[PDB]
Design an enzyme around this catalytic site. Structure first.
Site, PDB file in Angstrom:
ATOM      1  N   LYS A  62      42.605 -20.669  22.517  1.00 24.68           N
ATOM      2  CA  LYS A  62      42.709 -19.447  21.723  1.00 24.68           C
ATOM      3  C   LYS A  62      43.959 -18.686  22.097  1.00 24.68           C
ATOM      4  O   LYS A  62      44.255 -18.470  23.279  1.00 24.68           O
ATOM      5  CB  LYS A  62      41.560 -18.524  22.049  1.00 24.68           C
TER       6      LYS A  62
ATOM      7  N   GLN B  20      32.642 -24.022  20.721  1.00 22.82           N
ATOM      8  CA  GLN B  20      32.818 -22.843  19.901  1.00 22.82           C
ATOM      9  C   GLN B  20      33.747 -23.179  18.754  1.00 22.82           C
ATOM     10  O   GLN B  20      34.627 -24.024  18.882  1.00 22.82           O
ATOM     11  CB  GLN B  20      33.391 -21.664  20.692  1.00 22.82           C
ATOM     12  N   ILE B  21      33.546 -22.492  17.627  1.00 23.80           N
ATOM     13  CA  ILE B  21      34.282 -22.745  16.396  1.00 23.80           C
ATOM     14  C   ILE B  21      35.209 -21.574  16.076  1.00 23.80           C
ATOM     15  O   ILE B  21      34.834 -20.411  16.227  1.00 23.80           O
ATOM     16  CB  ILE B  21      33.332 -23.025  15.210  1.00 23.80           C
ATOM     17  N   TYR B  22      36.381 -21.918  15.597  1.00 22.67           N
ATOM     18  CA  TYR B  22      37.412 -20.929  15.295  1.00 22.67           C
ATOM     19  C   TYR B  22      38.280 -21.330  14.115  1.00 22.67           C
ATOM     20  O   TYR B  22      38.580 -22.515  13.899  1.00 22.67           O
ATOM     21  CB  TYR B  22      38.384 -20.752  16.456  1.00 22.67           C
TER      22      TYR B  22
HETATM   23  N1  NAP Z   1      29.039 -13.403  17.439  1.00 17.15           N
HETATM   24  C1  NAP Z   1      28.353 -14.492  17.780  1.00 17.15           C
HETATM   25  O1  NAP Z   1      27.526 -14.406  18.665  1.00 17.15           O
HETATM   26  C2  NAP Z   1      28.534 -15.819  17.102  1.00 17.15           C
HETATM   27  C3  NAP Z   1      27.786 -16.943  17.517  1.00 17.15           C
HETATM   28  C4  NAP Z   1      27.949 -18.177  16.880  1.00 17.15           C
HETATM   29  C5  NAP Z   1      28.822 -18.244  15.823  1.00 17.15           C
HETATM   30  N2  NAP Z   1      29.544 -17.169  15.475  1.00 17.15           N
HETATM   31  C6  NAP Z   1      30.420 -17.355  14.329  1.00 17.15           C
HETATM   32  O2  NAP Z   1      31.783 -16.983  14.489  1.00 17.15           O
HETATM   33  C7  NAP Z   1      32.265 -16.599  13.186  1.00 17.15           C
HETATM   34  C8  NAP Z   1      32.860 -15.198  13.205  1.00 17.15           C
HETATM   35  O3  NAP Z   1      33.473 -15.020  11.932  1.00 17.15           O
HETATM   36  P1  NAP Z   1      34.561 -13.898  11.617  1.00 17.15           P
HETATM   37  O4  NAP Z   1      34.811 -13.617  10.128  1.00 17.15           O
HETATM   38  O5  NAP Z   1      34.184 -12.784  12.513  1.00 17.15           O
HETATM   39  O6  NAP Z   1      35.875 -14.260  12.478  1.00 17.15           O
HETATM   40  P2  NAP Z   1      36.765 -15.545  12.292  1.00 17.15           P
HETATM   41  O7  NAP Z   1      37.593 -15.283  11.075  1.00 17.15           O
HETATM   42  O8  NAP Z   1      35.852 -16.764  12.357  1.00 17.15           O
HETATM   43  O9  NAP Z   1      37.718 -15.378  13.549  1.00 17.15           O
HETATM   44  C9  NAP Z   1      37.111 -15.710  14.781  1.00 17.15           C
HETATM   45  C10 NAP Z   1      37.936 -15.154  15.918  1.00 17.15           C
HETATM   46  O10 NAP Z   1      39.153 -15.907  15.979  1.00 17.15           O
HETATM   47  C11 NAP Z   1      40.249 -15.057  16.361  1.00 17.15           C
HETATM   48  N3  NAP Z   1      41.280 -14.997  15.292  1.00 17.15           N
HETATM   49  C12 NAP Z   1      41.040 -15.020  13.972  1.00 17.15           C
HETATM   50  N4  NAP Z   1      42.223 -14.944  13.314  1.00 17.15           N
HETATM   51  C13 NAP Z   1      43.209 -14.890  14.231  1.00 17.15           C
HETATM   52  C14 NAP Z   1      44.572 -14.819  14.116  1.00 17.15           C
HETATM   53  N5  NAP Z   1      45.135 -14.786  12.890  1.00 17.15           N
HETATM   54  N6  NAP Z   1      45.305 -14.764  15.251  1.00 17.15           N
HETATM   55  C15 NAP Z   1      44.715 -14.792  16.464  1.00 17.15           C
HETATM   56  N7  NAP Z   1      43.379 -14.883  16.590  1.00 17.15           N
HETATM   57  C16 NAP Z   1      42.614 -14.909  15.477  1.00 17.15           C
HETATM   58  C17 NAP Z   1      39.626 -13.709  16.645  1.00 17.15           C
HETATM   59  O11 NAP Z   1      39.360 -13.821  18.037  1.00 17.15           O
HETATM   60  P3  NAP Z   1      38.978 -12.673  19.127  1.00 17.15           P
HETATM   61  O12 NAP Z   1      37.703 -11.994  18.687  1.00 17.15           O
HETATM   62  O13 NAP Z   1      38.958 -13.328  20.481  1.00 17.15           O
HETATM   63  O14 NAP Z   1      40.131 -11.719  18.962  1.00 17.15           O
HETATM   64  C18 NAP Z   1      38.380 -13.711  15.778  1.00 17.15           C
HETATM   65  O15 NAP Z   1      37.360 -12.786  16.234  1.00 17.15           O
HETATM   66  C19 NAP Z   1      31.095 -16.689  12.217  1.00 17.15           C
HETATM   67  O16 NAP Z   1      31.203 -17.917  11.482  1.00 17.15           O
HETATM   68  C20 NAP Z   1      29.907 -16.570  13.133  1.00 17.15           C
HETATM   69  O17 NAP Z   1      28.692 -17.158  12.711  1.00 17.15           O
HETATM   70  C21 NAP Z   1      29.435 -15.975  16.061  1.00 17.15           C
HETATM   71  N1  NAP Z   2      33.113 -19.031  17.989  1.00 18.86           N
HETATM   72  C1  NAP Z   2      31.866 -19.268  18.393  1.00 18.86           C
HETATM   73  O1  NAP Z   2      31.324 -20.294  18.037  1.00 18.86           O
HETATM   74  C2  NAP Z   2      31.107 -18.338  19.295  1.00 18.86           C
HETATM   75  C3  NAP Z   2      29.780 -18.638  19.678  1.00 18.86           C
HETATM   76  C4  NAP Z   2      29.076 -17.774  20.524  1.00 18.86           C
HETATM   77  C5  NAP Z   2      29.728 -16.662  20.994  1.00 18.86           C
HETATM   78  N2  NAP Z   2      30.974 -16.385  20.584  1.00 18.86           N
HETATM   79  C6  NAP Z   2      31.568 -15.191  21.163  1.00 18.86           C
HETATM   80  O2  NAP Z   2      32.128 -14.244  20.263  1.00 18.86           O
HETATM   81  C7  NAP Z   2      33.186 -13.571  20.973  1.00 18.86           C
HETATM   82  C8  NAP Z   2      34.505 -13.659  20.216  1.00 18.86           C
HETATM   83  O3  NAP Z   2      35.406 -12.798  20.907  1.00 18.86           O
HETATM   84  P1  NAP Z   2      36.762 -12.243  20.279  1.00 18.86           P
HETATM   85  O4  NAP Z   2      37.767 -11.662  21.285  1.00 18.86           O
HETATM   86  O5  NAP Z   2      37.191 -13.321  19.364  1.00 18.86           O
HETATM   87  O6  NAP Z   2      36.355 -11.258  19.069  1.00 18.86           O
HETATM   88  P2  NAP Z   2      35.563  -9.905  19.217  1.00 18.86           P
HETATM   89  O7  NAP Z   2      36.559  -8.916  19.731  1.00 18.86           O
HETATM   90  O8  NAP Z   2      34.284 -10.191  19.997  1.00 18.86           O
HETATM   91  O9  NAP Z   2      35.330  -9.578  17.682  1.00 18.86           O
HETATM   92  C9  NAP Z   2      34.320 -10.356  17.074  1.00 18.86           C
HETATM   93  C10 NAP Z   2      34.445 -10.260  15.571  1.00 18.86           C
HETATM   94  O10 NAP Z   2      34.063  -8.934  15.188  1.00 18.86           O
HETATM   95  C11 NAP Z   2      34.859  -8.485  14.077  1.00 18.86           C
HETATM   96  N3  NAP Z   2      35.661  -7.288  14.440  1.00 18.86           N
HETATM   97  C12 NAP Z   2      36.214  -7.051  15.640  1.00 18.86           C
HETATM   98  N4  NAP Z   2      36.869  -5.865  15.589  1.00 18.86           N
HETATM   99  C13 NAP Z   2      36.710  -5.351  14.353  1.00 18.86           C
HETATM  100  C14 NAP Z   2      37.145  -4.188  13.776  1.00 18.86           C
HETATM  101  N5  NAP Z   2      37.889  -3.325  14.499  1.00 18.86           N
HETATM  102  N6  NAP Z   2      36.825  -3.960  12.483  1.00 18.86           N
HETATM  103  C15 NAP Z   2      36.086  -4.845  11.781  1.00 18.86           C
HETATM  104  N7  NAP Z   2      35.634  -5.980  12.344  1.00 18.86           N
HETATM  105  C16 NAP Z   2      35.962  -6.254  13.625  1.00 18.86           C
HETATM  106  C17 NAP Z   2      35.720  -9.670  13.702  1.00 18.86           C
HETATM  107  O11 NAP Z   2      34.901 -10.303  12.727  1.00 18.86           O
HETATM  108  P3  NAP Z   2      35.266 -11.463  11.644  1.00 18.86           P
HETATM  109  O12 NAP Z   2      35.751 -12.685  12.388  1.00 18.86           O
HETATM  110  O13 NAP Z   2      34.062 -11.648  10.762  1.00 18.86           O
HETATM  111  O14 NAP Z   2      36.423 -10.831  10.919  1.00 18.86           O
HETATM  112  C18 NAP Z   2      35.838 -10.443  15.003  1.00 18.86           C
HETATM  113  O15 NAP Z   2      36.165 -11.843  14.814  1.00 18.86           O
HETATM  114  C19 NAP Z   2      33.296 -14.209  22.350  1.00 18.86           C
HETATM  115  O16 NAP Z   2      32.631 -13.363  23.299  1.00 18.86           O
HETATM  116  C20 NAP Z   2      32.681 -15.564  22.128  1.00 18.86           C
HETATM  117  O17 NAP Z   2      32.098 -16.210  23.243  1.00 18.86           O
HETATM  118  C21 NAP Z   2      31.682 -17.169  19.767  1.00 18.86           C
END
Ligand code: NAP
Ligand code: NAP
Ligand code: NAP
Ligand code: NAP
Lengths: 58, 58, 58, 58
Positions: free
Chosen positions: D12, D47-49
């Site tokens: 990441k 984890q998925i991104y």
């Molecule tokens: N929250 C949970 O517990 C959880 C659990 C399982 C699955 N998920 C899944 O994760 C997904 C979240 O979707 P989403 O719409 O929030 O976010 P997203 O579009 O899937 O983006 C995921 C994260 O990737 C990073 N990212 C995205 N665009 C970036 C960019 N242009 N440059 C650098 N970093 C970038 C950010 O990381 P950072 O937040 O680190 O900045 C963002 O929060 C969903 O599909 C959700 O189901 C979430």
């Molecule tokens: N990727 C996975 O599969 C997975 C699974 C389990 C847990 N997680 C956890 O999810 C976390 C991701 O951390 P992170 O640094 O990427 O992101 P973050 O700071 O935890 O933000 C999570 C998501 O919240 C939304 N968000 C954050 N700030 C926002 C704002 N100011 N206004 C509106 N929406 C906002 C974005 O959603 P959208 O992406 O929808 O825009 C962002 O991707 C980690 O702790 C990771 O372990 C991820």
């Protein structure tokens, strides 16, 4: 091979619920056949699961 | 302090959707105020988000 | 009560690995005692698990 | 097309850390090019991104 294909509607069989469309795949030693599923209730949210956790529905 | 309390109905403001009840809390340097939210559509499934990502609804 | 407190170092007992610090808590019917754990290898990343999945380490 | 292939080592770019191997792919309207990444620190955890969140490393 694959049990499911892209677009199949699936749900988690037990425990925490999840239901929607197959949108991807993954493979690890722990999970040699896994799927990404986009919720049909929460557009854009995707969760990943082993094949054994999922079942296809109409 | 806390913006939300246990049981508040919240949703993600943008991007991937999520909606349901506050069921917990967490705190890291990256996310000094975060919440666990149980989906109202998918019982048992919980996702965690920073406070800024969420908004309270009735 | 709680099995763990904030800052305890814990790991997943089996299956997919995870290790780091307790940073929060959650509670659902499915998981009436759950914890948020920040990875010690990947700062900022947090995953949530039921208490039965975790064990405290020094 | 795809930016990455199976087995590429990626991390990441910002925010919460994650680093390891590409182990799968997914595609939604929100994330039309996404990847599953298995942590190199925590075997079995995936984890998925979106592609924009990741960068390839040696
Ligand atoms: N929250 C949970 O517990 C959880 C659990 C399982 C699955 N998920 C899944 O994760 C997904 C979240 O979707 P989403 O719409 O929030 O976010 P997203 O579009 O899937 O983006 C995921 C994260 O990737 C990073 N990212 C995205 N665009 C970036 C960019 N242009 N440059 C650098 N970093 C970038 C950010 O990381 P950072 O937040 O680190 O900045 C963002 O929060 C969903 O599909 C959700 O189901 C979430
Ligand atoms: N990727 C996975 O599969 C997975 C699974 C389990 C847990 N997680 C956890 O999810 C976390 C991701 O951390 P992170 O640094 O990427 O992101 P973050 O700071 O935890 O933000 C999570 C998501 O919240 C939304 N968000 C954050 N700030 C926002 C704002 N100011 N206004 C509106 N929406 C906002 C974005 O959603 P959208 O992406 O929808 O825009 C962002 O991707 C980690 O702790 C990771 O372990 C991820
Ligand atoms: N799939 C995703 O992408 C994703 C993303 C974000 C959030 N989540 C959340 O994660 C939760 C999954 O719920 P759930 O009903 O499937 O599972 P759970 O009851 O929350 O258990 C989670 C995991 O903990 C381990 N575990 C549970 N009981 C154990 C025990 N007695 N001994 C040893 N290990 C044990 C298992 O790990 P192993 O699988 O390693 O064996 C199990 O898969 C949901 O709240 C969901 O929203 C999932
Ligand atoms: N915890 C988080 O916040 C989070 C966030 C993002 C990603 N993840 C990822 O989710 C994965 C968890 O790995 P893992 O070794 O714990 O579990 P897993 O083997 O990936 O199994 C996941 C869940 O699927 C269900 N399941 C598995 N086998 C089943 C079977 N034979 N029959 C019915 N249901 C079955 C269980 O659901 P129930 O728990 O509902 O019973 C289990 O907890 C990791 O790759 C991790 O990174 C977790």
């Amino acid at each position: 091979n694959a049990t499911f294909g892209m677009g199949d509607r699936v749900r988690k069989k037990s425990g925490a619920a999840w239901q929607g469309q197959i949108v991807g795949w993954y493979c690890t030693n722990l999970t040699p056949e896994g799927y990404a599923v986009e919720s049909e209730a929460h557009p854009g949210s995707v969760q990943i699961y082993p094949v054994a956790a999922l079942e296809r529905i109409n």
